[PDB]
Amino acid sequence: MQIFVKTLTGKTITLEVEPSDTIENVKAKIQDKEGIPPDQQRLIFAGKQLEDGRTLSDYNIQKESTLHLVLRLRGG
Template structure:
């Protein structure tokens, strides 16, 4: 049996381009889209404007924290999505 504590990744950090760090508690089964929603709650940035980077690669919304082997203390990097057009 897996306890809830085993599923929780405490003190996950998201660093913005300005260097500000946001601490989030996320669970292994959280999808990247859910992590973006948590960032929106703290920073007010809509998920569609967010790109999360881990290990130099952009994270995909439909994958989970476990899919990326995230562990407590990891830092994700938040960049804003650029919109195309003139």
């Protein structure tokens, strides 16, 4: 499965993954090639967040889709 990830700099890169794989694998693979650490990553699709415990078929996430990546920030 080929998916698209819109980064913080608004450029789309591809990622090679599986619909049975967890979001933790998805985020691990972006860590290898960009350096971003999973626990700051947020993968969005449909305006809905895809948590670490989700996969990429819970929300019907197939190929030619674009996930929108945004980053965390602490405080309160």
